[PDB]
């Protein structure tokens, strides 16, 4: 770490040629941040901060994560209440049962009431292709199945095909992320659905020290 | 800012907490409501009587049986630590909020100071 070399020579000798040759030889799995000296003079933060930011960009990290997702077309949705009215508070909504269909068969799932709340938020009806992540409990509405494409002869619906493979597919995901990416994520997180969050989202992403 | 970064302050905070797995909750409401609550640990079990504000906090936290919760007797704030392992089988997919933790050991009421 911290080794430095200088490509010294006259104009039109091959300094940039050697730099790009090094980049090509290293391969696409090794970070390579090109720069020019003039770009360091920012107007939002000190040039020292911009040098630090760019300097960290060239430290890549390869992190792998296995994720389990439930995806398919909804066939049934039968919310159930607790066996006793005294069991819970208010609505006293218990687990929900959802039926998903894929190219390889069907599966009946038992879901938490939080997952049911996510379903209600995403406005999912019978026949819609959905996508549930057991990692976080996040529900995504892919769209309507191509089977029901011609149900109505004029309707604004994003018809999507039936998911391939099994309903419950487990995949190992590998991504390369820079240290600066983590720094940005901590500095300017994208989470939050409050009005304050939206107002901050509309703001320009000015660099900060 | 650089100068103050080079000086550190070591501050001590004293915390009094009760943590344990709630066994049974029984609430009666007309007038104000009254109820009794039982919390157990790995080596203790106790029945407590709940005031109106404590019941209100319990309801607003939506606590159920088998949950490990922490109450600060100074303020009465109720925090849900997590769920027991025995309830893990009940679902195929789990929400982000759910957590599985063991039952705390020792005495129900504990005093702890943190620096």
């Amino acid at each position: 770490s911290g080794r430095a070399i200088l490509l010294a020579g006259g104009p039109s000798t091959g300094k940039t040629a050697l730099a790009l040759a090094i980049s090509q030889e290293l391969g696409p799995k090794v970070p390579f941040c090109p720069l020019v000296g003039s770009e360091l003079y920012s107007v939002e933060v000190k040039k020292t901060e911009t040098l630090m930011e760019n300097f960290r960009r060239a430290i890549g990290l390869r992190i792998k994560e296995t994720k389990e997702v439930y995806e398919g077309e909804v066939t049934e949705l039968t919310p159930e209440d607790a066996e006793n009215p005294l069991g819970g508070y208010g609505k006293t909504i218990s687990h929900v049962i959802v039926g998903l269909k894929s190219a390889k068969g069907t599966k009946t799932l038992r879901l938490d009431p939080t997952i049911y709340e996510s379903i209600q938020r995403e406005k999912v009806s019978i026949g819609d292709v959905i996508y549930i992540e057991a990692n976080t409990g996040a529900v995504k509405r892919v769209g309507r199945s191509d089977a029901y494409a011609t149900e109505f002869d004029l309707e604004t619906e994003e018809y999507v095909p039936l998911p391939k493979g099994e309903v419950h597919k487990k995949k190992e995901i590998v991504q390369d992320v820079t240290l600066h990416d983590l720094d940005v994520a901590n500095a300017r997180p994208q989470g939050g659905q409050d009005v304050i969050s939206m107002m901050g989202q509309l703001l320009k992403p000015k660099k900060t020290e | 800012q650089a100068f103050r970064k080079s000086i550190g302050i070591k501050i001590k905070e004293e915390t009094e907490l009760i943590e344990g797995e709630v066994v049974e909750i029984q609430i009666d409401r007309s007038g104000h409501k009254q109820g009794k609550l039982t919390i157990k640990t790995t080596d203790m079990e106790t029945i407590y009587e709940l005031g109106n504000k404590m019941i209100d906090g319990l309801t607003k936290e939506k606590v159920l049986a088998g949950d490990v919760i922490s109450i600060d007797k100074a303020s009465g704030k109720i925090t849900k630590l997590g769920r027991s392992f025995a309830r893990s089988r009940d679902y195929d997919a789990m929400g982000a909020d759910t957590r599985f933790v063991q039952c705390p050991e020792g005495e129900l009421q504990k005093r702890k100071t943190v620096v």
Binding site: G88 | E24, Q26, I27, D28, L64, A65
Partner: peptide, 28 residues
């Protein structure tokens, strides 16, 4: 009251100042 009538005494003092189970839970 509007027809110049007094209110209930307990209600009067309460307004001047201002059983069955409903929820039972147990782990199976």
């Amino acid at each position: 009251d509007f027809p110049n009538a007094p209110p209930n005494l307990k209600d009067f003092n309460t307004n001047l100042f201002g059983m069955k189970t409903v929820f039972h839970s147990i782990l199976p």
